[PDB]
Write a protein that binds this ligand. Sequence first.
Ligand SMILES: OC[C@H]1O[C@@H](O[C@H]2[C@H](O)[C@@H](O)[C@H](O)O[C@@H]2CO)[C@H](O)[C@@H](O)[C@H]1O
Ligand SMILES: OC[C@H]1O[C@@H](O[C@H]2[C@H](O)[C@@H](O)[C@H](O)O[C@@H]2CO)[C@H](O)[C@@H](O)[C@H]1O
Lengths: 135, 135
Amino acid sequence: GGLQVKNFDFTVGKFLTVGGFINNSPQRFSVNVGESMNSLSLHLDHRFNYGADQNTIVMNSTLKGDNGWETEQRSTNFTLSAGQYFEITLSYDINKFYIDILDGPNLEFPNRYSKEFLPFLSLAGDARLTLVKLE
Amino acid sequence: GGLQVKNFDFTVGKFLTVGGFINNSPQRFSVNVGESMNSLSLHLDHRFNYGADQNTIVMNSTLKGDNGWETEQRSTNFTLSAGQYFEITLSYDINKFYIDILDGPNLEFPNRYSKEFLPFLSLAGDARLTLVKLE
Ligand SMILES: OC[C@H]1O[C@@H](O[C@H]2[C@H](O)[C@@H](O)[C@H](O)O[C@@H]2CO)[C@H](O)[C@@H](O)[C@H]1O
Ligand SMILES: OC[C@H]1O[C@@H](O[C@H]2[C@H](O)[C@@H](O)[C@H](O)O[C@@H]2CO)[C@H](O)[C@@H](O)[C@H]1O
């Protein structure tokens, strides 16, 4: 399940763009990059209507799936909308991830595990992934 | 090496679009889908300047990498150009692959191995893969 795209090596200095459509009436959706669903260098969660979290971006990582979430970094500079097309571009170096949301903010997050190559990508939650671009 | 895109299950009825740029002064480039580089249900080769083959599309499959190429199906309804951006959309059912080249022809090729799911994608040769889309 999934597609192995042989040509795409998301290494330091490359720009990975993910595009897709957010569901109508969303709770939240995340972009996840790392080694696997359980070992993620970046979990970027856009929470629309999620209890106390209303239009909040939560960023975190985990080495142990759902039982290893570490320190959250949050932002309320929230620019996505339910039912819309979105694009988010990610790049990183040995110190930081650089998150560029199209028509939105640029955010940074630590590269906690000193990764120089990331083999896995998933989108989870209330959205549909339609595009992956690497430049 | 490569990127595992968890969300993309290229199953019967889905449309996989590959986009990218053909090199300047190309010999040829191929789009390859299957289980691995050695076991391919479709090898779609656009040969620009490749000895006797000038602007010829060659389609084939292999179960044994470079030593298992089977019966070629060829077309000279060739519409791509060196140095240009291209997009090719692929879909399939249990009998055939359907190849839609943007601004070009629609071609069919047998689904020789009765595949209903294809986990691997590569572009080889004189071009750069920049985009993968699945709908
Ligand atoms: O950190 C990302 C992670 O958050 C989980 O929820 C957190 C919640 O954000 C926090 O306020 C609370 O203290 O702990 C919860 C559990 O770690 C989500 O459940 C998970 O899906 C991720 O999004
Ligand atoms: O069939 C795809 C496969 O072709 C190889 O070349 C063929 C050539 O097209 C054919 O005319 C000749 O009879 O046999 C050659 C070897 O099988 C390419 O070398 C290979 O890369 C594929 O493109």
